Design an enzyme around this catalytic site. Sequence first.
Site: not given
Length: 319
Positions: A50, A53, A60, A180
């Site tokens: 992906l 990654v 990990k 906002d």
Amino acid sequence: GGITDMLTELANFEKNVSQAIHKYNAYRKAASVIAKYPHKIKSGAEAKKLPGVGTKIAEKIDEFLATGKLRKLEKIRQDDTSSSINFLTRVSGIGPSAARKFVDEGIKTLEDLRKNEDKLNHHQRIGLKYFGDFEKRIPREEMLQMQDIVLNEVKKVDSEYIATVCGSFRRGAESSGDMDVLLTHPSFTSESTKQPKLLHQVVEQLQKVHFITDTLSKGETKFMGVCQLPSKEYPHRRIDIRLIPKDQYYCGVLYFTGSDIFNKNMRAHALEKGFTINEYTIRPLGVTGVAGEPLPVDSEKDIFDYIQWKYREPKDRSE
DNA sequence: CCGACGCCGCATCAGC
DNA sequence: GCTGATGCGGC
DNA sequence: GTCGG
Ligand code: NA
Ligand code: NA
């Protein structure tokens, strides 16, 4: 959820403790795309396809999947320096630098902060004052109520003010995190002025109806503060009020409504069709690459027109 | 291999 | 007092 | 930490 939990944990740590800002953005993007993958991941290598990654996060992911933990995040959850820095950055106005310095001289808890008020600046005292209220989402029907006041309140000072509430809210989300509001008037354009205190006269006014209650920072274009509905007593919410020239307002509205992934693709598609979008203007690209002068935008669709895009109503400005 | 990776308004501080 | 740098929040 | 020139 576990993987994106862990990734986000690694991000906050790199931001707050490491001060490795770019490592933090990398874990963040890594976590967003995994959060969007529509299968349970089964190997590190799988996510490795992906975008965002790479070799170290997938190692990990394998360790997490094999063991249900990450030895590194454990060592980080121990080690009281890292966790106290990380905690203190939850106080608005307390960034990685202030937090690190605080823990260095023993300032580690919310209570340590109370006892040391004199060692905080104004933004930090307000953030500490509203610590719990700021971490809590703002549901939709509350925004609407909050909308009804700002729009109505700012119409009173001068009906030639134009105000728009943007963010998730105007894309239609049911939860908001803050408020906002963007703001303009016939006087204010990029070529000129004609009115000194436009944004002041908004803030002074919502102060008088006791909606705005504190100021984090204020100048002639950006205001940051706390607001609150009338009275249980309603929680205090964060509010930003931004005064923008008229010639750039709709680029402002288009930008500050998002999402970041919708601006991602609209900006990149603008380049396909020969235009470059920034939060301020849409400008043509000469076939040499140099941008031209800003085009005129009178509504949001004008921007959609230049890059020859069907208009996407804010409700579906997700992707 | 190696620099890029977000850019800005306001508050505050270092440094003169 | 001035000006430029940096911390900060955050789209 | 991941990406791309
Ligand atoms: Na990849
Ligand atoms: Na903070």
